Design an enzyme around this catalytic site. Structure first.
Site, mmCIF file in Angstrom:
data_model
loop_
_atom_site.group_PDB
_atom_site.id
_atom_site.type_symbol
_atom_site.label_atom_id
_atom_site.label_comp_id
_atom_site.label_asym_id
_atom_site.label_seq_id
_atom_site.Cartn_x
_atom_site.Cartn_y
_atom_site.Cartn_z
ATOM 1 N N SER A 159 0.846 -1.424 0.075
ATOM 2 C CA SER A 159 0.108 -0.002 0.066
ATOM 3 C C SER A 159 0.830 1.256 0.026
ATOM 4 O O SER A 159 2.208 1.092 0.503
ATOM 5 C CB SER A 159 -0.827 -0.138 1.177
ATOM 6 O OG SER A 159 -2.002 1.182 1.113
ATOM 7 N N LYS A 218 -4.916 -7.054 2.531
ATOM 8 C CA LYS A 218 -4.845 -5.858 1.450
ATOM 9 C C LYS A 218 -6.382 -5.784 1.033
ATOM 10 O O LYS A 218 -6.887 -4.430 0.863
ATOM 11 C CB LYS A 218 -4.103 -6.079 0.534
ATOM 12 C CG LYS A 218 -4.045 -4.837 -0.463
ATOM 13 C CD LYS A 218 -3.440 -3.873 0.017
ATOM 14 C CE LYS A 218 -3.631 -2.514 -0.970
ATOM 15 N NZ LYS A 218 -2.853 -2.782 -2.281
ATOM 16 N N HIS A 230 -8.381 -3.769 3.790
ATOM 17 C CA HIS A 230 -8.194 -2.478 3.693
ATOM 18 C C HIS A 230 -8.601 -1.554 3.001
ATOM 19 O O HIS A 230 -8.965 -0.417 2.940
ATOM 20 C CB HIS A 230 -6.492 -2.463 3.809
ATOM 21 C CG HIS A 230 -5.676 -1.464 2.901
ATOM 22 N ND1 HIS A 230 -5.899 -1.231 1.375
ATOM 23 C CD2 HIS A 230 -4.863 -0.290 3.488
ATOM 24 C CE1 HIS A 230 -5.017 -0.097 1.237
ATOM 25 N NE2 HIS A 230 -4.511 0.357 2.356
ATOM 26 N N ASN A 231 -8.958 -2.214 1.550
ATOM 27 C CA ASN A 231 -9.297 -1.398 0.536
ATOM 28 C C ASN A 231 -10.886 -1.180 0.803
ATOM 29 O O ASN A 231 -11.634 0.063 0.362
ATOM 30 C CB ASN A 231 -9.299 -2.154 -0.959
ATOM 31 C CG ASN A 231 -7.823 -2.411 -1.473
ATOM 32 O OD1 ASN A 231 -7.071 -1.667 -1.030
ATOM 33 N ND2 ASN A 231 -7.839 -3.412 -2.454
ATOM 34 N N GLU A 273 -10.972 1.646 3.499
ATOM 35 C CA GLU A 273 -11.002 2.959 2.737
ATOM 36 C C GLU A 273 -12.203 3.686 2.207
ATOM 37 O O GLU A 273 -12.557 4.825 2.430
ATOM 38 C CB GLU A 273 -9.806 2.910 1.718
ATOM 39 C CG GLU A 273 -9.591 4.240 0.925
ATOM 40 C CD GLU A 273 -8.416 4.036 0.008
ATOM 41 O OE1 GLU A 273 -7.359 3.526 0.161
ATOM 42 O OE2 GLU A 273 -8.998 4.345 -1.227
#
EC number: 1.1.1.44
Length: 467
Positions: free
Chosen positions: A128, A183, A186-187, A190
């Protein structure tokens, strides 16, 4: 064997990671499927560095210190498998392949298992921070075969973004596809954070009638608080930004955020695994709704809303701030519930505190709040839900009156708050010992003889003849 590590694929991300490793004193062997790019890189972006090239995979492998470490940064999918297939016959037992691309976590799990059986150690790592992050330090989320971790830790933590106390935002995430799963979440997180800021903005603008620079200042002030985060920082800057004609730029921008975005995968994962990650779901759907711009223009000419704000402005602004904070707590609690469920499904051991730390650094979602999540898991590594940690329990309790006022007022004013409202609905559901879902069970037993359980005898399925 003079090179510490190799990296395959020479697009900007890979180049920048190579240069980062170089700057940290590691000798990197660069390779690319079109080999002319190796020479180009050496002559330009890597000029004057310790970076070395290779003209074939065999040559690249020969240059590496054992156990060999090879990073793949190439297009996700078949390109990764095809490099793996070409590499295996060239490597030795105990050698290490790290996929740092945008790979789907199920592919990572498959590769980890298959390579382990062949004596090759596989790491999938989230990355990231984008191109700038790759260059000066990324957040890295490695997971995989943990036998590889002691061998990559020095390089990976060395190049990683650091927080202000010095900890690297990279640590072992967990087994198999866990790094890429993290990951993915996390996306989605966001999306949630951005939508939350949008709802706060909408309330400032349309309930409080605030000026653009006034809203910029509010976000700036908020950033000095518990909310201190990169997304709030850039929001303040955006709000005060003037175009060349002296008019604010943001009001000129088309409000359509797209229907196809990657955040959808987090919400889909939640549905697949049966985890109520409601806020990210609403954030994804809000982008979808925004993409309906022509439909909304037409609807706005047809459909009517409800209102005038009579209260104390400063107090209500504070209510919005607290609604935002509480809703954010719920979103992250939900995201961590999804991580927990994946761990259960696959038998993974996840480093929850480490994940919070990894989401600082290069990540867009970086915040002081994430440090508090790390603190919660450090206090209790067995913590079952973020909402049960004393810090977060206290925070929500201190925010909830404000939260309800903000939502009630927005509802009366006709301001859409899909994320604020879903977060509050979730909090009110999660904290209730008894929910109406028993009525769903009764309905299904009534119409389909599906049966139901008694509170007093869980696991025993009963059919009642209701008619």
């Amino acid at each position: 064997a003079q090179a510490d590590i190799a990296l395959i694929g020479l697009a900007v991300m890979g180049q920048n990671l190579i240069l980062n490793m170089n700057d940290h004193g590691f000798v990197v062997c660069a390779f690319n499927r079109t080999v002319s790019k190796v020479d180009d890189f050496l002559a330009n972006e890597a000029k004057g560095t310790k970076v070395v090239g290779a003209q074939s995979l065999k040559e690249m492998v020969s240059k590496l210190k054992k156990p060999r470490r090879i990073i793949l940064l190439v297009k996700a999918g078949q390109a990764v498998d095809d490099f793996i297939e070409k590499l295996v016959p060239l490597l030795d037992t105990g050698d290490i392949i790290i996929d740092g691309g945008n790979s789907e976590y199920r592919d990572t799990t498959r590769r980890c298992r298959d390579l382990k059986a062949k004596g090759i150690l596989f790491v999938g790592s989230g990355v990231s921070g984008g191109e700038e992050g790759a260059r000066y330090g990324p957040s890295l989320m490695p997971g995989g075969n943990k036998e590889a971790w002691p061998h990559i830790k020095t390089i990976f933590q060395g190049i990683a973004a650091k927080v202000g106390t010095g900890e690297p935002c990279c640590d072992w995430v967990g087994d198999e596809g866990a790094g890429h799963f993290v990951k993915m979440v996390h996306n989605g997180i966001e999306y949630g954070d951005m939508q939350l800021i949008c709802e706060a903005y909408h309330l400032m603008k349309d309930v409080l009638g605030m000026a653009q620079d006034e809203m910029a200042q509010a976000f700036e002030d908020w950033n000095k608080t518990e909310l201190d985060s990169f997304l709030i920082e850039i929001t303040a800057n955006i709000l005060k930004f003037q175009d060349t004609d002296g008019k604010h730029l943001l009001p000129k921008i088309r409000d359509s955020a797209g229907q196809k975005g990657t955040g959808k995968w987090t919400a889909i994962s939640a549905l697949e695994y049966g985890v109520p990650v409601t806020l990210i779901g609403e954030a994804v759907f809000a982008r979808c709704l925004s993409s309906l711009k022509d439909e909304r223009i037409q609807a706005s000419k047809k459909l009517k809303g409800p209102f005038q704000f009579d209260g104390d402005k400063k107090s209500f602004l504070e209510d919005i701030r607290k609604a935002l904070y509480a809703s954010k707590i719920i979103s992250y609690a939900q995201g961590f519930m999804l991580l927990r469920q994946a761990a259960t499904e696959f038998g993974w051991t996840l480093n929850y505190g480490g994940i919070a730390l990894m989401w600082r650094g290069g990540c867009i979602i970086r915040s002081v709040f994430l440090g508090k999540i790390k603190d919660a898991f450090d206090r209790n590594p067995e913590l079952q839900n973020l909402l049960l940690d004393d810090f977060f329990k206290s925070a929500v309790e201190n925010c909830q009156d404000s939260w309800r006022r903000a939502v009630s007022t927005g509802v009366q004013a006709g301001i859409p708050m899909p994320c604020f409202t879903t977060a509050l609905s979730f909090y009110d559901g999660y904290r209730h010992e008894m929910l109406p879902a028993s009525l769903i069970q009764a309905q299904r037993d009534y119409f389909g003889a599906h049966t139901y359980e008694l509170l007093a005898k869980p696991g025993q399925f009963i059919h009642t003849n209701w008619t």
